[PDB]
Amino acid sequence: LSGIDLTDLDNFADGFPHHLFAIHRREAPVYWHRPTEHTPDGEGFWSVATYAETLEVLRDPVTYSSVTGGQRRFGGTVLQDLPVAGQVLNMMDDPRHTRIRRLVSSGLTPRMIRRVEDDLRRRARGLLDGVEPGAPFDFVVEIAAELPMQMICILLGVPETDRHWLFEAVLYTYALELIAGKRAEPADDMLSVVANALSDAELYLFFHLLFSAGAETTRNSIAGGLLALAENPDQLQTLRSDFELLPTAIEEIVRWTSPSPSKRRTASRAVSLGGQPIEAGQKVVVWEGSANRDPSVFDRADEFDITRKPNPHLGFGQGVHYCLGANLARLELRVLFEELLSRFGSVRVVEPAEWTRSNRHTGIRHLVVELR
Amino acid sequence: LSGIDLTDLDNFADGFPHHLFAIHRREAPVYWHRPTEHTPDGEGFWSVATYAETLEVLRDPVTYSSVTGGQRRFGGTVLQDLPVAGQVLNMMDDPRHTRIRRLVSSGLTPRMIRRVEDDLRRRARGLLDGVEPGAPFDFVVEIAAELPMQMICILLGVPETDRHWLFEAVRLYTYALELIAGKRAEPADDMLSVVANALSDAELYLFFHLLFSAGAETTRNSIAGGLLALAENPDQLQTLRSDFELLPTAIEEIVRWTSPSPSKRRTASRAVSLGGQPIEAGQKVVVWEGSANRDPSVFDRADEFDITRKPNPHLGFGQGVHYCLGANLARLELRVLFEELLSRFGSVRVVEPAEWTRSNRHTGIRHLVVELR
Ligand code: HEM
Ligand code: HEM
Ligand SMILES: O=C(NCCCn1ccnc1)N[C@]12C[C@H]3C[C@H](C[C@H](C3)C1)C2
Ligand SMILES: O=C(NCCCn1ccnc1)N[C@]12C[C@H]3C[C@H](C[C@H](C3)C1)C2
């Protein structure tokens, strides 16, 4: 561990480095990672690689704050200190977090869910209908990105005409206008619900939180799922032959892909974690991408198994900040794989996957496939 | 004023709308501007167009906070509330403001000012030597942008080889964080090192951008606007070019006239009256130095450009505790550029109408096509 820099992004250029986290889990489940030239803020942090200790952190939001602690001016939930701490739902503590989470949730109505589902089924059908069997194409650009971006446009009440403003961005001006329109005439969408309850800055952070959940996190689960099934063709065949297995399979996709593999917190008081003495103000990073392959908890943790049960993965978090979009993500994955696997039992990856170079997101930038 | 929206940027796309602000000074020096669809946050604000009241706000930083007030979560010094309030020098209050201000000015050493000056003189001479007389060219892109960007690169300690990251932004984020890390590893004789080695990466980046803004936006705009004004006033151009002893007075007039940073926001921290109106804690207050700088109660012939204007107690660099730390650097940029240009050229023709930036926070020219002879 002394020689491994978890802030050196070159270690993440080829995917999540499971082999380095095996070392971390074995040698030091909780340890103090000194800063290097790559480390945000020039400051060390506690690094947590195992499941039980990761959950200890997640389940104690008072001790392990999503805002700040000690004399630290601001923290948040990424390793770099950010002044947006406190001002966006994921970087918020109680009592404000409970209120705002209730407000956001109030906008995820049964009708919105059906609106998303109806659009997703039509769109996924159309996209998969236009695939040329056996012809190579980039699955990330042509399919994986499109579906969840349209979902988030529907949640945010972005008119169909204006969705180009969002896509081209993967903006501020358009979002502020969209925000002012909804204050003017409230509309039946989540951006309207939050805008008519907050500053424009807070609204824009919310906007980007969800644009990120779709554009990035959900897209990455989709592409990663296709790659995992491509690597496990026997499992692909089993799954396509009985979609009753799909909900269980989707959970394994999220555990395996862990698209959001790390979180930061800030200790608010002295505390002992994994036998280590944490001080008020210090940064703690948990690695759900490592917890999710902890062999203390998951049998054959380094194998993809679409039947895995139980599957208590931390891919959508755990506790008070648990992913509000978890079921939307599941719905995207379910519909996409129904339409894809109904059509195609052969998935060949024809160039090596190109990964995003990040320790905050595990994502595939390009995945060139042929479907038959 | 009932039919005027000072938050509608269509009103600022052609320069600062001096006509609207003459109406504002006449009708209601201080008044409550209701929000429109263009108004940040959907919230009204007090708008302050006259010199006396502008000055009064600037000079009372306890009442008129640069952070927040009342129950408001965060404010800052633009109309939109920003969560960077409290975390960058200009959006800070005492006691932290004083500490950080002194830190930053400790880096404006005589040797740094010399480094800037020696570079400026060389580059300004190079650039003007390169001009083809009579041939049209974009003064903003070719000259007015270049000089002050080089200045702020010197202040922040950006190696000449990495200066393109900044020019191409006007990728930078990533570069700035590596530059910050390098100043922590190996302290250098520059302003960024001084601040880095006294703060989070965020805070340092916000400081980096503050100075970057100061150079690439505000100083650039003074230079381009100063040339436009001289072009519009050719007799004064001639008088100036005959006697460079007039330059210091002229430069103050350039700053008054151009008012490159023509508005500021504050947040009231307590109940107070301004211009005979009651302000309550939490309420936004926007002052318009661009307007104050043409208030006829203070400036004779206020709507006329006069290079000899004395006195000239303009608010173009602020006033009170947040007064521009770069005032002498901006004046130096202006002085060298106009020495060098007016030495060579007594004829300045603007050949395409000026293209203005669309903003009520900055008054600046995006393109200014000139011929010099
Ligand atoms: C496969 C896709 C997704 C994954 C893996 C994922 C993962 C996560 C995780 C790990 C957290 C916990 C954050 C923390 O502990 O600090 C979270 C929170 C959150 N997610 Fe997702 N997410 C996904 C999709 C979405 C979608 C589509 C939405 C759209 C509604 C969404 C909205 C949210 C929100 C609003 C939070 C913050 C909840 C709170 O702090 O109370 N997520 N997500
Ligand atoms: C013609 C060019 C410039 C103009 C018109 C200008 C204008 C201003 C104004 C109006 C303020 C007051 C802000 C407030 O009251 O909220 C200010 C502050 C400031 N200026 Fe400039 N500026 C110019 C160039 C520069 C330069 C070249 C620097 C480089 C050091 C600079 C550095 C600063 C700093 C650091 C502050 C904040 C000081 C504080 O908050 O304590 N400015 N400037
Ligand atoms: O914090 C997140 N995403 C959390 C992890 C991914 N996710 C999103 C929803 N479910 C999972 N995103 C932002 C995006 C912008 C705006 C704010 C603050 C900074 C900058 C980061 C939020
Ligand atoms: O606040 C200013 N500029 C003040 C007026 C221009 N100026 C600068 C120095 N003298 C004059 N700039 C920032 C630039 C970035 C980073 C912080 C906060 C936001 C976003 C705005 C500062």
Author numbering:
A (entry chain B): 7 to 176, 202 to 228, 238 to 412
B (entry chain A): 7 to 176, 201 to 228, 238 to 412
How is this structure described in the published paper?
In contrast, the binding of the smaller imidazole-containing compound 7 does not lead to BC-loop reorientation, and a putative CYP126A1 dimer in complex with compound 7 in both of its active sites is observed in the asymmetric unit. The overall conformation is similar to the proposed B-B symmetric dimer, with both chains adopting a conformation resembling the imidazole-bound monomer. In addition to heme iron coordination by the compound 7 imidazole group, further contacts with CYP126A1 are limited to hydrogen bonds with Asn-96 and Ser-252 and with the ligand urea moiety, whereas the adamantyl group remains largely solvent-exposed. Although compound 7 occupies a binding pocket similar in nature to that observed for compound 1, it appears that small changes in the conformations of residues lining the compound 7 binding pocket (Gln-86 and Arg-400) lead to distinct packing interactions with the FG-helices of the opposite dimer. HTS type II compounds 7–9 produced new LS EPR spectra consistent with distal ligation of CYP126A1 heme iron by a nitrogen atom. The magnitude of change in the g-values for compounds 7–9 suggests heme coordination through the imidazole, aniline, and pyridine nitrogen atoms, respectively.
